[PDB]
Structure formats: C-alpha cells, structure tokens
Write a protein that binds this ligand. Structure first.
Ligand SMILES: O=C1c2c(ccc(O)c2O)CN1Cc1cccc(Cl)c1F
Ligand SMILES: O=C1c2c(ccc(O)c2O)CN1Cc1cccc(Cl)c1F
Ligand SMILES: [Mg+2]
Ligand SMILES: [Mg+2]
Ligand SMILES: [Mg+2]
Ligand SMILES: [Mg+2]
Ligand SMILES: [Mg+2]
Ligand SMILES: [Mg+2]
Ligand SMILES: [N+]
Ligand SMILES: [N+]
Ligand SMILES: [Zn+2]
Ligand SMILES: [Zn+2]
Lengths: 368, 184, 368, 184
DNA sequence: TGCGAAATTCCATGACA
DNA sequence: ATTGTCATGGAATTTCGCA
DNA sequence: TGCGAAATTCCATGACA
DNA sequence: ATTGTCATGGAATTTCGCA
C-alpha cells in the first residue's frame, strides 16, 4: 500500500527501490523515470491482481508475462511475483508441457538362468487368419528363446490355455507382463499361485518395461511381413516357421542363437554348429554354463544435459493416459512417497491412492 | 565314435485307446534318447495325420536327426516318410514283433505307462488336463544310471519344480479295488 | 567349380586361398583346417545357393547370415558374397528399417513482408461446438499474426468462404499448405489464380514443412484447453478470444507480439505498449521497418554423426504412407533425378512418375 | 498533444436498406480515423445486436480506444454501451442532426457510397459477394493529403494489390439509363 | 616389425502401434 | 509394488598373411 | 574496478494427432 | 515442383547498484 510509497515520494530510501532514480507523482499515481521510460509503481496491495491479469490474457509463462507487465509498471523483483503466480495457476500446471527430460534408462541384469523370468505380451489384431487375430508371445529372459501361440482374443482364458501347454516343458520362477486386461485378472493370478509362479507387472503405460518381448515382437512382425510379400496375409501357418527361424538366428553381439543359449547344442536345423562334436554332454554343459555367465551386458547411457531425477517428497505430475480432445495432458500435482530406483517411484496419487509409476510418465511440477 | 547328444534320436510311440478325455483317445510319446526327456501329445487317432500335426509342434522347437519307431501304420506310411524327408529327419524302424530301443528309453517308457494308469483310475476321463503335470514329473525324475534328471541334461540347470518325493508309482488297496471294478 | 579346387588339392597356390593351410579331401568334398576347426570349401558354382539358403532361414543381415554359413563353410571373401545377396533380396530391402538419419533441417528465411506468405491448415475434428468440428488456421509467415475460422468440414468450400473474408484485408503473394484434400482441389486452384495468389505445397506426409502453422496449432489447442478446464468443451465462442490473445502475446526470443510486427503499434488491449507515443506514424513505420529486418533467425543445427544426404542418381526408397498390417514399410528402390536442396529431392517413383519428396520420407538403399 | 495513430478512433455507420443480397440488407461501415482504413460488414438490420455481432469480428483483430457515431438507435442503446464498456472502448456521439467526423473520413465515406452505387447498378443483388473487392479498392486508393494509401499506413508496406487505374467512380450513359429505370 | 587387405567389432538408428 | 532392447550396415579398429 | 544480486539471455525439451 | 517451429523454465551469463 501507500505506507512504503508515501515514505518514498519525499525521498527516503526503501530497500529494493534504488536511490538514484527520481520517484514522482502524477495523475494520482506514483511513477518513476527508468531508462526504458516512465512506469507506474503500483502499491504492493495491487501487485498480485496485476500479475494475474497479465498472466490470464493468454496464460503465458515467465518472460511473456513479464513483458506485458513491464509495458506499464515497474516495481522491485517483478519476476518473483510473476513466478509466484505461475506456480499457483492450476490451469498452466496441468496443461503445459515439461521441458526436463527423464534420467538415463536402467539396463536391468539378464536373468541368470533359463526359466528364471518369462516376458509375455500380445501382438494384434492382425488380419484374420483361420479365425485367429492375435499372437501370444512368450520370451525367456535369459536365452531370448521364444514361444508363439495364435489366439482369437488377448484373453485370460487363451493365455491360460497356451501357458498350460508351454509349462509342460518347465515352470518359470517369474512371469513379467504389462497391465493388459488378460494378465491382471484374478483368474490369471490364481492360475499362477497354483504353480508357485510370481507375477511381475510393468509400471502402467510403459512398454519399454516389457522391452525384452516388445523387441522380439518387432522381429516377429518383420519376418512375417517378408514371408508374406505379394501373398495374401495368411500368417497362422507361418507361426511355427517364424518361431523356429528366430530361435535359431544369431545375435551378432552375443554370437549365439537363443536355441544355443537354451540347450547348449544345435538341433537338426540347417547350418547346425558342430564345434562340440567331440565333447561329452557333460563337458558341453560345462561350456554352456561358462558361456551363459559371460554374455555382453550393456550399461546406462550418459544422462541428457537437462534431466531430472525424483527426490522423496517432491511435487510431480502423472501424465493423463488417454486424454480427451482439448483436455489437459497432466494430472494435478502429487508427492513422491518412495524412490524405488532412479527411474521408478511411488506417489500419493490424484485420488488418494499409492501408485507405482515410471519416471517417463511424470514431470516435476514447475516453480516448486 | 562321437558321444551321444540331445536331439540325436527321438523315440516315438502311441499309447491307447484310452477313455475319451476332452475328445482325445491317444498319447503320442516322444522321448529323447540321450537325455530321456519326454514330450506327450494327445491325439484323436493313431494316424499319420495326427502324428504329423503333433510332431509339427515339437519340431518347431527342436528337430531330431533320427526318429525311431516300430512298424506302426502311421509311421510306415509314405506321407510320413515324405514329411520326414522334407525336414531332413532319417527314419528308423525296429523289425516287426521285435521292439528295441535302449534300456534308458525302455525304462522311461515303462514309467510313462505306470504313471498314466495310476492317474486315470478315479478320473479316467480327466487325463487331458493332467498331461502337463505328468511330463514335469517324468522330466524331473532322477535317473539312477546318470547323476541327473532329463530337465538337467537338456537345459544344464536345476529346475524350479524338483520332484523331491520320488513317488510310489504303485497301485494302493483302494485303487486295485476300483480298477478291477471299472475294467470288468 | 572343381577347376580351381583341383589345382589346389595337390598344393599349387590360388589367389585368395592362403598358402599356409592344408587343403585336403574327405567324403568327396574339399576341406581345410582353419583355426576355428575344419570347414568345407564349396566350389564357386555352389556358393550363391549356399549364401541364399542361409540368408533365407530368417532373412538375416550381414553378420547373422555369415555366422550361419561359417558353421559349415569357409571360402575367400565370404562377406562379399553375403552382401551381394542382401543387395538383391527384394524382401529385405523393402521391409527393413534404415539405420542412417536424415541430414540436418533447413531453417528457411522468414518472409520479408506481412502478406508475402500465408501458411494454412486445419485442426480437428474437435468435439462438436454449435455444429462446428474444425478450425481453419491461417498464419502470416512474417509476423506470426493468425486468423481463426470455425468450419463444419476441412472442405474447399469452407476454405474459400473464410479466405474471401480474410482477403478483404489484403491479398497474400503466396499461400503454403500441405496436401490436404481441401487445398489440392482444382476449385481451390482456380480460386487462387483468379487473385494472382501462388499456391505452394509441402512435400507429402511431412508436416514439419507447414511448421509455422503446425506450431501455432499447438498454442491454439493449449490455450483452448486451459480456458476449458472443468467446463464443457464449448470452443466455438472462444475462437475470437484465443485469436486476440495469441496475436497479442510476446515471443520471448523476438520481444514482439505478432500484432506489433503487423501494425507497429498496440491497439486498445490490456497492457498496451506506449513507447512510440511521441513518434509520428511515419517515424513509427520507420522503426517498424527496422525492427522487421533485424529479427533473430535460427541456423541449421549440427548434422548427426550418421546422416546421409542425397546424391543425383542414387538408389533411395520412399516410405509407404499408410502401410497395411504385416506389409512392407518401404517402396521399391527408385533414383534421385534432381536434388532441389539438401533436404528435398525429385525421384523417379514406384510407378514411373516424378515425385517431389522430403528426405525424411526416404532411406538410401542398402549395399548399393 | 501526442500525434494521431491507427486504432485511436473508429468511425462507424450504417448504409441501407439495400436490395437483398444473400439475405443481407445493410452495411456497417468502420473507418479508421488516422489511416482511413475501411472495414465493411453486411447485416440484416441496423440493430444493436447486428452491430455487436459485427464489431465482435473486428475487435478480435484490433480494438479502438474510441468509437464515433451519430445518435442512431443501435449505437445509443444501453446494450451497446454495456458492450463498449466491457472492452474499455469509449463511446462518442455527434449532436443530433449535426454529423461531424474529419475531412479525411467525410471524403472516405463519400467514396464508399459512390463506389457502392456504381456496382449495385446492373447487379443490385450481387453486392454481398463484392464487398471484399470493394474494401481492397478503398484501402489501396491513393490519398491526396497524405503521400500514402490506408493499406500503406496501417501495415507500413506496399500492397500486392495496387489499384493503379484510379477509377472513374462515375456513372456512364448506360448506367444513368438503367438506374433511373430500376429506381422508378 | 611393417604393410595392405580382410575380418571383426563398434554403435547410432529406429521400432516393438 | 519396479527397471528398455537389439537387428542392422557403414565405419573404426584389429588381425591376418606375408615378408 | 570489484562485489552480490537481479535481469537478461541461452537453449534443450517437446508437441503441432 | 521445395525447406520445421517456438513457448517454456532452469541455468549460464551479463548488467545493475553501489562503493
Ligand atoms: O507393444 C505395445 C503395447 C502398447 C500399449 C499397450 C500394450 O498392451 C502393448 O503391448 C504400445 N506398444 C508398442 C510400443 C510403443 C512404444 C515403445 C515400445 Cl517399447 C512399444 F513396445
Ligand atoms: O498437423 C498434422 C497433420 C498431420 C497429417 C496430415 C495433416 O493434414 C496434418 O495437418 C500430422 N500432424 C501433426 C504433426 C505430427 C508430427 C509433426 C508435426 Cl510438425 C505435426 F504437425
Ligand atoms: Mg501388451
Ligand atoms: Mg507390446
Ligand atoms: Mg506302437
Ligand atoms: Mg493438415
Ligand atoms: Mg497440421
Ligand atoms: Mg447513421
Ligand atoms: N538388475
Ligand atoms: N530461404
Ligand atoms: Zn495460467
Ligand atoms: Zn531377405
């Protein structure tokens, strides 16, 4: 108010208003002659309303708001008040984009053994082939060995059917999947408890987390496409072929095929490797154990020059999953309860629940 | 001569007819010669066509150099020979009336019949659903001659389902009683 | 054939087969004792068939194919034959992904004057508001000044309606648009010739080329979203508001609003800048001409470490636009006729036509 | 006193009734005081409501500090005053029966009536479609008092449509003939 | 103990929709 | 309560064949 | 002729679907 | 016959106020 501004019009020094400028009166308003021209100094009790009117014109950020205000006013530390408003504009906070990138991705260790961890997923809908529309893909984490099953839907019932056939071979310690309807059902839960299999889920809307199997999907679609060039897309009869072809393909970085990492010896397929012809099986299995433990493993890449990593108690916002036309892309702010690892957090969510989410589906809330 | 390996030789054979279960009447039995690993496939008939359908599933996982069988119709048909030739699998027949495998295989095949018999009594109609659990049993069964189970020899690792209670595999008083009743 | 291989079995030196290895016979086949083990040397007349069978197993690239062959064979310069096959596999060439990035983007000069160049586009479908579903967006290249019109469809007829109203203000030299149905129609062509307006089109499927207006779309959707927070999405009545709000918003890098770049003076809007209060109009227009010519202009960023730039006569492939499920993502190879600039080419296309396409919708064909 | 600027003052007025054209009967005329730039809007009536609808289009491009009008009903209504106040536009009325503008504006307004009259003869029904071309004409017309057209003073640049054949704007023998026939 | 060429390894690119 | 992946083909680097 | 703080400029991020 | 763009908010840098 006029408290400070009275005390100024005479010529006493108030902290923040630099002494070397002349602060007069005119038209009933305190003014000042600043290099850029003459500007009104409003009373402190007017300042928030001003910053707010300027910000609301087009819901602009720090500079674009300041330049509007600067047109008519000066006062000390304008941007501090501007930023105060930006931090409280519900509408800006939930609609604006982030400009900080996620921290560098983790490269989890490879499962130590075949059957320690299965990654599973559906591809589809594909063009109908014999009344089939999807493929269940099951990928052993350690070996890359992959099983394919054609289904009529990405349903729990068809998942259970196919895995009953698969697990006739071995039972896996863990099965990791995303949060598809087929995997999160209680039926599937029961099906797994019945066998002492642990169900592991990806954070929601984050397929990188099923990267092992997602990546194998690419190879499956790619080979299927090539085999189908200038033919009708009858893929059902090619699943078996694509399966065997891929399980027996070399990985240039590893120098092994998934079949070899699984069995330690080629079967009767074309170009079968014969290097262990003179070893006993037991010597062979010895060599396999060795090969398994020394496979190349990548490491987290450098962080980008403007990433953020979550701190306990920080205000962060979850990305809205399927945002309606003309609706905000972000949820209201929420707090980081726990930091599970540098790329995964638990938050106290938009209702009042605990949610485990990927850092890729969060931004840090701006202006604190 | 080079040492024996998995995929060197699969021994195949039919078992049945059995009481119908989800529409099925037979079990195609595949046993790896070196490891003693067993795969079981349920079929509607002992035909070339059912054999081919089933072996097409297995051979999309691993291909044997040799298939050994008796002179069953399904296996001596020229369709079945065309199939095998297409995949570079050599066929091998035991002379008629004189079945010969290997002791390991003989013994494995024996266990298979016994363990089946044991579970079809009481539920002679519910075996289709049980084939998974049977295979895990057979493949995690310890072999006296080798230090190791077939799971172990196939994959070179212990199994998340060890079958530590090496079973009876033997018909109790209440089972001999309602098996000599059901088959009467 | 056996020509060279006879001459070798005795012990004479053939170019390519190194002398220090022993080349014997066994099972009716030429062999050799290489550090990795004993490998068959097939006759030259067998080699292509072998490379082909190995490649076809899963349509693998250079190394993953070589490792299959190496399992049974050795011969001199295996990869040369492998690469020869990869270059001829129709199926691999049109299905595989590229692994070379485009050259660095151009930053075309800003139009020199208001009305030299309009960039136009449709946003929508939006939620229906008064029976309206789209917005025609028209953006002056030089100033950023934007006009908005609500329409019922992205049609030529509604484009013509709106531009008749707009061009009552001035007529533009050029109107740049993408290849939407509404802009490529002959009716629209005639409508423009009638006024001595030149129609300029983006390369197909390349919205970056309309970047000026695409980018303005973002701001329009963003402000509309904020104004609609917890209200029904009734956007029709907000067009006028969003228009005026955006035309009068500062660009932090430029320090001018589009309205100022257009008129050189603010109108009676909030926070109107008053710096030229004492200038005559003519002095003001003098200052505007100055401000216009000295605006910040960005420059092409550094090339990525693995980009390609098109050379006349090169084999390149156009990306299929809307590729069906399980169908290739690339067209057959074609030849670069002319290099219009480093990011734009004319090619002799997949039928037999001339096409002007963006380098972003091309890969260079692999293995020459 | 500070020099005169664009947006300082808009002068507005109705012209009509005219023969119907695509349903319309009037032209709201807006002329910028400083530059002489003209905007024209077709309306169905000289009402506050039609005025507001039209000025809402214009004022989403630029807002005048002052609107000047005569004491037409539409402009003196308290709805129209509420509108103007909402946008911080001051209203300004010439005293009744005594219209006063500025010479520039007077002259501009004159040209507008003449150029209209000229094009409604022969096609008295097709003017709605012609309003665009009329405005470009008026705004690319050279002003004797200033060295410059309104386009030039508004945008500070030459125009892609110069109207180099400063027109007749005058009724020929065949037009006086079928205008004294149509209005008889 | 060094050269030219081949073989191997490196790694940015892009797609799992 | 969880976490990216890896075929690909030019280019960079190392190894091979010979002296 | 140099300090501490404020003001300005820089610029990677991401969305135009 | 053509071609990316620019609001955003932390951080880096420069300028201001004072001595
Ligand atoms: O595969 C799926 C998938 C998706 C949504 C829901 C599901 O249930 C899925 O399985 C998206 N998606 C493709 C995809 C897009 C981007 C990055 C990666 Cl890594 C990726 F795999
Ligand atoms: O706006 C359009 C648009 C599209 C397809 C056909 C049209 O006619 C369009 O107008 C896609 N698109 C969004 C878009 C995606 C990615 C980059 C940029 Cl720059 C971008 F603008
Ligand atoms: Mg999924
Ligand atoms: Mg997936
Ligand atoms: Mg038999
Ligand atoms: Mg478009
Ligand atoms: Mg667009
Ligand atoms: Mg009047
Ligand atoms: N890990
Ligand atoms: N340019
Ligand atoms: Zn806001
Ligand atoms: Zn191929």
């Amino acid at each position: 108010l006029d408290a400070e501004l009275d005390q100024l019009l005479q010529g006493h020094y108030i902290k923040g208003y630099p002494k070397q400028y002349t602060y007069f009166l005119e038209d009933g308003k305190v003014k000042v002659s600043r290099p850029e021209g003459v500007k009104i100094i409003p009373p402190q009790s007017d300042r928030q309303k001003i910053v707010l009117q300027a910000h609301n014109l087009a819901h602009t950020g720090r500079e674009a708001t300041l330049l509007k205000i600067a047109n008519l006013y000066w006062w000390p530390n304008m941007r501090k008040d501007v930023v105060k408003q930006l931090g409280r504009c519900q509408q800006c906070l939930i609609t604006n984009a982030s400009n900080k990138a996620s921290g560098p991705i983790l490269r989890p260790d490879r499962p130590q053994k075949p059957f320690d961890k299965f990654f599973i997923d559906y591809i589809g809908p594909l063009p109908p082939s014999q009344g089939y529309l999807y493929v269940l893909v099951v990928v052993d984490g350690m070996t890359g060995f992959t099983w394919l099953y054609p289904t009529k839907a990405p349903s729990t019932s068809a998942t259970v059917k196919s895995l009953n056939v698969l697990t006739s071979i071995a039972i896996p310690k863990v099965i990791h999947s995303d949060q598809g309807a087929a995997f999160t059902s209680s039926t599937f839960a029961e099906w797994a408890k019945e066998r002492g299999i642990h169900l592991e889920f990806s954070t929601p809307y984050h397929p990188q987390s099923s990267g092992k199997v997602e990546r194998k999907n690419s190879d499956i679609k790619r080979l299927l496409t090539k085999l189908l060039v200038g033919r009708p897309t009858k893929w059902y009869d090619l699943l078996p072929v694509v399966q065997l072809a891929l399980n027996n393909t070399y990985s240039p970085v590893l120098k092994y095929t998934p079949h070899q990492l699984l069995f330690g010896i080629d079967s009767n397929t074309p170009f079968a490797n014969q290097d262990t012809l003179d070893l006993t099986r037991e010597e062979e299995l010895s060599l396999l154990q060795e090969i398994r433990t020394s496979l190349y493993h990548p490491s987290t890449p450098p962080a980008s020059s403007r990433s953020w990593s979550p701190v306990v108690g920080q205000l962060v916002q979850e990305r809205v999953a399927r945002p309606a036309s003309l609706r905000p892309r972000w949820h209201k702010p929420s707090t980081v309860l726990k930091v599970l690892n540098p790329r995964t957090v638990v938050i106290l969510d938009h209702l009042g629940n605990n949610r485990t989410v990927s850092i890729d589906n969060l931004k840090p809330t701006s202006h604190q | 001569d080079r040492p024996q390996k998995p995929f060197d030789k699969f021994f195949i054979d039919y078992i049945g007819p059995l009481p119908p279960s989800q529409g099925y009447l037979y079990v195609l039995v595949v046993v790896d010669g070196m490891t003693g690993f067993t795969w079981l496939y349920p079929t509607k008939a002992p035909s070339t066509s059912a054999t081919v359908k089933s072996l097409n599933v297995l051979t999309s996982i691993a291909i044997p150099k040799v298939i050994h069988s008796d002179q069953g119709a399904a296996f001596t048909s020229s369709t079945f020979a065309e199939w095998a030739k297409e995949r570079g699998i050599h066929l091998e027949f035991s002379t008629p009336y004189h079945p010969q495998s290997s002791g390991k295989v003989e013994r494995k095949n024996s266990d298979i019949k016994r363990l089946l018999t044991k579970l079809l009594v009481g539920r002679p109609t519910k075996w289709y659903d049980l084939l998974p659990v049977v295979q895990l049993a057979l493949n995690n069964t310890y072999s006296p001659v080798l230090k190791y189970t077939p799971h172990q020899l196939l994959f070179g690792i212990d199994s998340n389902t060890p079958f530590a209670n090496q079973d009876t595999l033997d018909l109790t008083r209440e089972e001999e009683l309602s098996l000599l009743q059901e088959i009467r």
